[PDB]
Design a protein around this ligand. Sequence first.
Ligand code: AMP
Ligand code: AMP
Ligand code: AMP
Lengths: 300, 294, 290
Amino acid sequence: GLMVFTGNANPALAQEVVKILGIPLGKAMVSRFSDGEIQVEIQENVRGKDVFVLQSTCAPTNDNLMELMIMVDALKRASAGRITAAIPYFGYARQDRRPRSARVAISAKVVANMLEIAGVERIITMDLHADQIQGFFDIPVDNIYATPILLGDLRKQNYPDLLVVSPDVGGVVRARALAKQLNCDLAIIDKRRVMNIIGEVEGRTCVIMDDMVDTAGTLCKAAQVLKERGAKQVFAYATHPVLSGGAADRIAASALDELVVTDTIPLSAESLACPKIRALSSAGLLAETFSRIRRGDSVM
Amino acid sequence: DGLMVFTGNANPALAQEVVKILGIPLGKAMVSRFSDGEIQVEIQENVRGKDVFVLQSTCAPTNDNLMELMIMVDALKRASAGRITAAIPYFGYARQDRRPRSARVAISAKVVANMLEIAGVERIITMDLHADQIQGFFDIPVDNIYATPILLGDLRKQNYPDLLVVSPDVGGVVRARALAKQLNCDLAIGEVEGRTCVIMDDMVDTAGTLCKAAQVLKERGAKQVFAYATHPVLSGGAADRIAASALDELVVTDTIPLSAESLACPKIRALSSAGLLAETFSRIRRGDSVMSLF
Amino acid sequence: DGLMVFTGNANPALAQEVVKILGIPLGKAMVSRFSDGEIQVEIQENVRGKDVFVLQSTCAPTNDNLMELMIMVDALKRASAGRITAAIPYFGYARQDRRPRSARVAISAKVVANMLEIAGVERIITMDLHADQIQGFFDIPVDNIYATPILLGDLRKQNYPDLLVVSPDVGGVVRARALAKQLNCDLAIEGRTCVIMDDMVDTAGTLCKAAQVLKERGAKQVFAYATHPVLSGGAADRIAASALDELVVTDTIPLSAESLACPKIRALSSAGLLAETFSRIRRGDSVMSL
Ligand SMILES: Nc1ncnc2c1ncn2[C@@H]1O[C@H](COP(=O)(O)O)[C@@H](O)[C@H]1O
Ligand SMILES: Nc1ncnc2c1ncn2[C@@H]1O[C@H](COP(=O)(O)O)[C@@H](O)[C@H]1O
Ligand SMILES: Nc1ncnc2c1ncn2[C@@H]1O[C@H](COP(=O)(O)O)[C@@H](O)[C@H]1O
């Protein structure tokens, strides 16, 4: 019953997922017409099958979302038994509210509604930006943590004298949790009119952990501030390597020693040319989730 | 009064011309991008209880323009707009209106219909919808307006001798004979020598079909060949192949903005659909008959 | 196994033949009328957890046959059917699929799509749907099957001399070339045997004009094939009197008394094609492979 299809966002990652699952990748043309409208054709029988669609909605965001939307409709109309959208990086997640009642959209909610009306029956996502996005859906949402992958690597590196750093006074909650888990010290960076650091950073190898890195502006600003307070090294772990706005070259010039990321969003040719950026494989964690959910489907 | 018109980046010049005719300013909005390319939207004006029309064709880039419309509609809805009408002169994805011999494809135009309704769109205005059945993909009111008064207006103005209407296709003889009956001239699909031939389509994309017909018609001795179409999709080497073709001119509307290479091509002339849209909006606002116009 | 098939009054005989082929009994139901003419339905056996198919063309009397299907679906749903599929070989209201230029009309085919879905229908099976765009009126899966195999089966079965596929209307000239290609014969818009193929026949007006103007101008024989025999308002008389040599149709709509009487009208069984479609769907096999 289990089938897996992919869009163009992450096709290599999907091949690794099905490899582990011991199944072939479902065949589909996912392409464009001459005018740039999305052309999709499911090129095998999906009738009554349990279908997973692996497509992060990373850049180009709207294209990847519409690829997903259209694939879902084709699968629905071809009478798939069940449709799951596996969206490791969730595009528009950062637009989850209207700050100070600004006349903006709650885009994460539009996307939620979009997927539901296309006929998506459940969501799998990774390190979702805000827990509250789960309530934008009236269908089941499974949010998986890539923390094991990242902590796995950080441990292999055996850094002395490890210290977790919270870049801002947001995730102090989560930074203490990480520091408790590796039982090391915690330091916090903040700006009161980035100036203040509480906890001495002097002899420390500092580590920063995040859901995503975008421009890398925060990571790189934090890293300097740490080397300015004597830090030996600064390392950044992040699940989703968005890496827009000349981030790779900003990283290249920074006080940051290394950026470790997941392969949810494949690396640019620029990023692959950047020795400070290194990827880890999220495929095993994805396959394990697909298998747990599949087990549930065969209960009834 | 109460009426407001907004626009994304699909067709800004058309929007400006529409509001000029309406006698109102364009609604203030930032429709932009974040560094990662996700759409950035803020309504920069009060819209509470207002009768809001969003003017955005879902032309290329199709998905970006559709999502701008989606996100603007959400922004407006949450800012408590009284009513939201999507004015989509060119409806992208309209050609995916079925599954051919039931191939395992999407009915994309239905997906988009569902998306707009779920975002909070209450009414649709569109021009020369590729398929009339698309009106049935919606459960909200759909007004399909026609560029015929513009295109026929201009064609009649030209005052061509020995005027003959041609269906380039076969799946177009119905519309073509209706057009022939309205111009009272003969119809070809027929006899052609010595006569000025006119083709009317709702759409022009690559022009491959268009230009082939012009060639064939001339071979059989057509005096001149003219083409009239509402929507200038015009990809990818369309403008170039129209230039190099037996086609004397191609007249279109401005529902899709012309490219640089299309603006360079001296055979492509574009007519404003702005008057047609503005009168439509205006009639809708007063409850007057829209049908009348066509 | 967990498969159940019920019929309304639109096509009882056909449903019995489908069900005979499948090797199962027809589902026990009363589908009838109260004294005032309101639909009376009771499901007279247990359906819970079962995979229920209802076979009902919404041919004339359209609204009664449509309302029978609505009421049956509701009763089945409330009797906890595991799943409901409406098998509607002829889909009534299919010709109302748009609003023409200057007409304040309903898109009735869509009202019907909405009705069916709100009743609890989960999957549609239909035959030679009049406009493919109707599939987009539903947000449930729709399987449109073709009667070409049973029509072409019969056509080849009588080895007509000098066969020529004819397109009568300008509309379906495209698929007329696709038919000719499949029989490897010519296409027309003389002294040959002409076959016309169609989705349906209603008044037979255009068929009969076509048959005449083919005959006037030469043709040996004229034969017509159409899946759906609607055949309303004088159709049988118009056909008897026409240049047609035979009209061949399927049994998705049972022949009225007048059509039965007309020796030019011959009906083929669609039961094997419906029964194969049910099995393939049930097994998860591909339908379009047919
Ligand atoms: N794709 C994006 N890229 C950069 N910034 C964004 C994006 N989407 C939303 N934002 C901004 O980030 C803010 C939310 O950030 P936060 O306060 O950290 O949850 C929103 O108010 C937006 O202005
Ligand atoms: N954006 C597009 N550009 C070109 N062809 C398309 C597009 N969308 C759909 N089609 C195809 O064009 C055909 C519809 O054209 P028509 O036969 O004129 O209705 C279908 O086979 C579609 O798959
Ligand atoms: N039950 C019906 N009988 C006859 N004509 C119809 C019916 N329903 C709709 N129509 C009209 O038939 C035309 C399309 O049908 P067709 O000629 O089969 O393509 C439209 O102009 C409809 O208004």
